[PDB]
Amino acid sequence: XXXXXXXXXXXXXXXXXXXXXXXXXXXXXXXXXXXXXXXXXXXXXXXXXXXXXXXXXXXXXXXXXXXXXXXXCQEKDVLCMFEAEMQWRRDYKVDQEIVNIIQERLKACQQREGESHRQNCAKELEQFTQVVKAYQDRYXXXXXXXXXXXXXXXXXXXXXXXXXXXXXX
Amino acid sequence: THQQKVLRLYKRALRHLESWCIHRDKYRYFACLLRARFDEHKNEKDMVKATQLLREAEEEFWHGQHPQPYIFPESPGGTSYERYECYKVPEWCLDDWHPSEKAMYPDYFAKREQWKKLRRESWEREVXXXXXXXXXXXXXXXXXXXXXXXXXXXXXXXXXXXXXXX
Amino acid sequence: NMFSSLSLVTLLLLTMPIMMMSFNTYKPSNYPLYVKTAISYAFITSMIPTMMFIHSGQELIISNWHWLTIQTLKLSLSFKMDYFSMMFIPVALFVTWSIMEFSMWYMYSDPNINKFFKYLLLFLITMLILVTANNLFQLFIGWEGVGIMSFLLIGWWYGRADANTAALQAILYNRIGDIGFILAMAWFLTNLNTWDLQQIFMLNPSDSNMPLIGLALAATGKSAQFGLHPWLPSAMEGPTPVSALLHSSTMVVAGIFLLIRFYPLTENNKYIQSITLCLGAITTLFTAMCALTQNDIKKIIAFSTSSQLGLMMVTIGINQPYLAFLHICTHAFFKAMLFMCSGSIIHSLNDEQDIRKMGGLFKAMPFTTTALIVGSLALTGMPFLTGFYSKDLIIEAANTSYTNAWALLMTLIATSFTAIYSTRIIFFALLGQPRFPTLVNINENNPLLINSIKRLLIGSLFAGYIISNNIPPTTIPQMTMPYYLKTTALIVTILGFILALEISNMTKNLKYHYPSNAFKFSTLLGYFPTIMHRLAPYMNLSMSQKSASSLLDLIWLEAILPKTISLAQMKASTLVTNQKGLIKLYFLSFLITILISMILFNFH
Amino acid sequence: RWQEDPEPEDENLYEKNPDSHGYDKDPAVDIWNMRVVFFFGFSIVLVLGSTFVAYLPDYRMQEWARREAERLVKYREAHGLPIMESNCFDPSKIQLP
Amino acid sequence: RLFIIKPSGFYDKRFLKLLRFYILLTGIPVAIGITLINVXXXXXXXXXXXXXXXXXXXXXXXXXXXX
Amino acid sequence: XXXXXXXXXXXXXXXXXXXXXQAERLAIRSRLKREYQLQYYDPSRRGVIEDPALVRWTYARSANIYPNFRPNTKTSLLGALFGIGPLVFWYYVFKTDRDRKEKLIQEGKLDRTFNISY
Amino acid sequence: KYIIPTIMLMPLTWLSKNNMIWVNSTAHSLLISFTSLLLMNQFGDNSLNFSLLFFSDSLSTPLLILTMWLLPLMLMASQHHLSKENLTRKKLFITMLISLQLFLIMTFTAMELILFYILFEATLVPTLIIITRWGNQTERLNAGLYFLFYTLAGSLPLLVALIYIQNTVGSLNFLMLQYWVQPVHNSWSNVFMWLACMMAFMVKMPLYGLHLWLPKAHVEAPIAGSMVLAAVLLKLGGYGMLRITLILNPMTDFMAYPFIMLSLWGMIMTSSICLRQTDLKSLIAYSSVSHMALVIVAILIQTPWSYMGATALMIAHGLTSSMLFCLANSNYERIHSRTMILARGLQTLLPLMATWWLLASLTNLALPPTINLIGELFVVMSTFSWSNITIILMGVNMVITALYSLYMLIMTQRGKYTYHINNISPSFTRENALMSLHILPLLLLTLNPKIILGPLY
């Protein structure tokens, strides 16, 4: 909901015109099992949801934003670095699961189309290629294990290539 | 021994014959042909000529040696259940059974206890009888049979008694 | 909504005996019957979603038990119910359904009667995981799980010698097949961030490294092939329902099953198309040749699977996944019958596993012999004996291609070669005069046998009516060459059987003919016990014993610290034992020490 | 000559003068130790300890990050063009060379 | 009838009985663990208001035993 | 190892020296069997028998390491080339693959766009 | 919270009466191990320090829980031994385990390198007394001297290494302060700075060269089999390789390149010998070389994926090899010899222990995701990003991983046992409990392996 895109709406409607037979085996079993134990499971779930009554709201998500970036404070000192290093590790842990959502968007496209596969969608394909390429350059993926102090050197390496190539042309 | 080496090859030749031929009536035809070949040299005893034929017997047989021979059922080595189907349980595990469970079916436990008491008493008499045999080294080839009739049990008692049941 | 709910029921029903395995409730003698009753209702619950698939519906489900959150990944227990996965479930369940009630008759009155059923359920569960696998990590659970449960089943009979060689080799040759499969994992993760099977259909990369050294190398380990196949005749050493499952529906599909699911990769790559058929060309005749010379009831059927696997490899090489699964589904019904109806002979005439000694006539046994005739002819190209609906569709499609000509010609000889070993069950053992294995041998039909074989006949006859008609196909192959391509599939079975009957009767009915000793037979075993049972285990152990252990791991790699002990003790002896007392000698050394500090060392 | 070296003897509890036990000597010590407190650790560390492991107390932002990511996706999609990653923790750096 | 092959059995079967007796003894909180989801409510997804950040449990979703 | 003809019953003669040779083999075979017979067929034992031949078999690999190897000769140096040698073999394999990879990252990109894992 | 109740185990064993001892030492240790899982697991984005620098928090160490898991288990299998001798001797060699447990907690908890070093070598002292006494076979001293003169010869260069860093670059201390560290310029003078930090951990984590430290410690058995579990703890006790390579030398990986190649050949040659060997304990001793060699490969790559497999394998091997040694001890207490060929017979004589033999053997291979599939496979996946050639060598090793396990099974799965008359009772209630307490914790890690691999997970 909200964040996940997916398809808008599915059609799914049966006609059944050819052959009389015993109506349909798929339709008869669907109507029978809906009231057999599926209706009892819906009644038991409603009985437990109503039994809760009082519920705590709770904060759930925590704030804490910015508090000075790592590429603003320099020189080896524990008082300034510790707040900056916690900020970068917060962003890195979230960006690991940002890609996961975009990856699941591509997972949703594969099943819903099936036969089309790569012929349609295109929006999820373009969104995945843009993020992963940016994730490869900015958030390590090449510069060893995670470190906030080494990240500034990784950003400087990409900035040096932009300054050298543009000056020639 | 010359006699044993001929019999060992002849026993192998008959069982190796049924791998090449399919039907039992055709097997009997070739069996009579093999008898006529060996009876020609069996009539006279030789020290040089008969030993030359023994080494010659390895040839022709080795030319058609591997058509995957039949061992039939449970045979020493070969194919199709050599040690399989018979998992078995050792006699040492029988006495190892704990109480309460040992109380169930008392006919098997009481009869085994009587045989165990007889085996314990005969063990002292069997040890003196085994060293009584004239060799004065340890043993010669095979184990010697019992001479005494009153004491019974020929050397080993647990060799034949309690083995395996399929 | 009903599709998602009923799909998990089939998974839960098979785990219910395992849930009641750990004590729970006492069940004496009823535990072998409890497995039969659990799978009986599992078939009915699996029939409905397949009937829904013919109508309308396709659903993918996850249990939300994602154990991985590591670096842009989610790995839940995914269950795919789509085409190749959906249709295979009721086919595999109906095959087992007969084998479980067969397991009541065979292996009866054993101390480990309950434990035998325990591993067979796990052998069914691990396969069902591999079938419904939508994650590549989920795919490993099935592909290794079936290969690891086979150890307990092939080496089930507790033999001191020879029995454990087969169980060792079953995983040993499988783990050389793993080299590709684990390489297929590592390439998939590095090149594609998604890791799951839902990626390949969009933004498909054109690389030869992935399927060749990967899925094809996995297809050589699992499911026979040419690469490594000495584990097939050795697997016959175990009990007969075990050898039935490994070569009909379970272990025999695992190699091919991966290649069908990875169908967009095979179509795009041209180099993969050739190598799948070039390796598939050697699988067709070389393994079929071994079925002729080897004369054992079980071992003929063991090599017949690998000859059938050649056609299963051609389907991947021809780029037709739709006709790929159709052959294996019908193959499941072919050898569920053929393995244990022939296995019924072994138990009847004492304990004989040879075709030469066996003489089970058609008049002597009425029920078992009828299945042997139908089952053998079903493998060959027969118009309505479920052979035409599986085997003949591949042969007609193969002729119209830009693919290799030598691979196409080699498959045509193998299709006619099927008639030889199928008649070598009938003419060699069943037909003619009985060989008489033992004096006074009892053979009788049991109530458990009648309920199993007769209900297998429905699956072996109606397979070309239900599976072929209901499944939606893509692109019709039959169009060109009425005599060169279309007729050649049926004529090979007719000319092959006539050649088999003329060759077998000439040696059997001759009386005086004399068999020739000198022959050019590279056919007895295919010379694989000479290189992979004689040379390959020796070369890995000679480098372990002549080298490694007797040179490095005990002497040379140790020689770092004993090197600084043998030289250290020599330096130790030059101070303690040196200078045998005497104040004279110690004071003579003090003369030099002052001269070192003044002349040799520059300080004042 | 060994003099006093010969003293080695085979010893096993098994079942003789023990009935059924795990601890060496005394039936009273055996039951209270080998079956009670031996299996009390089997009940507290294994059964009651299964509730913890990783399930319940969040465990290093595994469940927290999912709720945090989803609200950041919907906010950045409506206003901005670039999705999440574009320039990670870099805004006006004092040159390079 | 035969005496057959004998094993120890008495020592073997007792251990499995002694193991399972202490699984069942702490199998009661396993049974309570099911009813904790049944009787008491687990968690609901809702936006937090600026009043209290943490009380008893700071941030815990699913299962009352987690809090 | 196998020859042109498999050894099983090839080349056998009765003679006089060979007849006494089989008598020598049975003399030790029966001697070691009877001491096993005296140990197996009594209920008073209860335990695992030692057997001096089997202990010396385990002692052959676990011990007798440094009492041996005192004649090194040229055989030991050949074993060193089969041990320390293959370690130097991969040094010209892994480095050549890495130098192939490192050149691609800087100029003419070969790495996939949909790559993020490690 | 962790230290102090562990120290109170020392007066517990001495004050208690002669009839008890073993009941108090095992029961009280189990409730301390429960409380370790209760508090240590809680962490934020970056794991925040516990208190003052004496014993600190865990950042990527769920391996402390394993030490707490063996804390009672190092007493269960040692019950068969020590019982024949004096009551004062019993109390002494329980307290030597308590001292081991005291120092082993201190190594993993304390986020340091200077004070960590004097706890790193401090574990060697109680194990030395443990190995040099109670050894049933001879050459205790030809294994006891080799136990120190391999480790201390490599670890004493840390005094000239670690102190040299803190004298130039700030101070080592907290590691959370360690961001002063500048990348190494890579010169001929900087070669011996890197080697001295590595060679200390190159011994405890066995390679191809200088690996003979481990088999001598295992074959020559200290006490029964419970002390061999502490020898497994020493392998994973050199965990500082996770900390040094990441922090102290981040730019230095060019000098790591020859050391990976050494450990890569310490996979084929170490496995080949682990096939034709006679001793049952030795066939676990050489398989433990190759299993821990996988970790050394993963560390020197320095990729974020490899540390996940590295941290997993430390816990994976710590409860699978120790499980295998308990099975080796269970045959050593009955047959009285460590020979594989002589001690032959499962299922027929050992009906329920044979299922524990199967579960322990198959865990060495890649089973359904317990811990070793999350351990081994993660390293193999990470090696391809290093170089494409690796899996050609690593795949061959995956064949021989079966050849440790199945060869140990088959050579015991023959139901002959003609020479053997002993082993009447299959297993005591404690002996079967040992086997369950090793596999069932790994079976609980199937549901959630987050507390099995966590360096930024």
Curated annotation (Swiss-Prot), chain A:
Transmembrane segments: none annotated. It is found in: Mitochondrion inner membrane. Belongs to the complex I NDUFB10 subunit family. Accessory subunit that is involved in the functional assembly of the mitochondrial respiratory chain complex I. Complex I has an NADH dehydrogenase activity with ubiquinone as an immediate electron acceptor and mediates the transfer of electrons from NADH to the respiratory chain. Complex I is composed of 45 different subunits. Interacts with CHCHD4. This is NADH dehydrogenase [ubiquinone] 1 beta subcomplex subunit 10. The gene is NDUFB10. The chain holds residues 77 to 143 of 176 of the full protein.
From Swiss-Prot, chain B:
It is a peripheral membrane protein. Its main location: mitochondrion. Keywords: Acetylation, Electron transport, Membrane, Mitochondrion, Mitochondrion inner membrane, Phosphoprotein, Respiratory chain, Transport. It is found in: Mitochondrion inner membrane. GO terms for biological process: mitochondrial electron transport, NADH to ubiquinone. The keyword Signal does not apply. The modification Phosphoserine is found at S75. It comes from the Eukaryota. GO terms for cellular component: mitochondrial inner membrane; mitochondrion; respiratory chain complex I. Mammalian complex I is composed of 45 different subunits. Belongs to the complex I LYR family. Accessory subunit of the mitochondrial membrane respiratory chain NADH dehydrogenase (Complex I), that is believed to be not involved in catalysis. Complex I functions in the transfer of electrons from NADH to the respiratory chain. The immediate electron acceptor for the enzyme is believed to be ubiquinone. This is NADH dehydrogenase [ubiquinone] 1 beta subcomplex subunit 9. It comes from Bos taurus. The gene is NDUFB9.
From Swiss-Prot, chain C:
Keywords: Electron transport, Formylation, Membrane, Mitochondrion, Mitochondrion inner membrane, NAD, Respiratory chain, Translocase, Transmembrane, Transmembrane helix, Transport, Ubiquinone. It is an enzyme of class 7 (translocase). GO terms for biological process: electron transport coupled proton transport; mitochondrial electron transport, NADH to ubiquinone; mitochondrial respiratory chain complex I assembly. The chain crosses the membrane at residues 3-23, 42-62, 86-106, 116-136, 139-159, 170-190, 212-232, 240-260, 272-292, 309-329, 365-385, 412-432, 456-476, 481-501, 581-601. Its EC number is 7.1.1.2. It is a multi-pass membrane protein. It comes from the Eukaryota. Its main location: mitochondrion. Core subunit of respiratory chain NADH dehydrogenase (Complex I) which is composed of 45 different subunits. Core subunit of the mitochondrial membrane respiratory chain NADH dehydrogenase (Complex I) which catalyzes electron transfer from NADH through the respiratory chain, using ubiquinone as an electron acceptor. Essential for the catalytic activity and assembly of complex I. This is NADH-ubiquinone oxidoreductase chain 5. The gene is MT-ND5.
Swiss-Prot record, chain F:
One of its GO terms (cellular component) is respiratory chain complex I. The chain crosses the membrane at residues 75-94. Its main location: mitochondrion. The keyword Cytoplasm does not apply. It is a single-pass membrane protein. Disulfide bonds: none annotated. Complex I is composed of 45 different subunits. This is NADH dehydrogenase [ubiquinone] 1 beta subcomplex subunit 4. It comes from Bos taurus (Bovine). The chain holds residues 33 to 129 of 129 of the full protein.
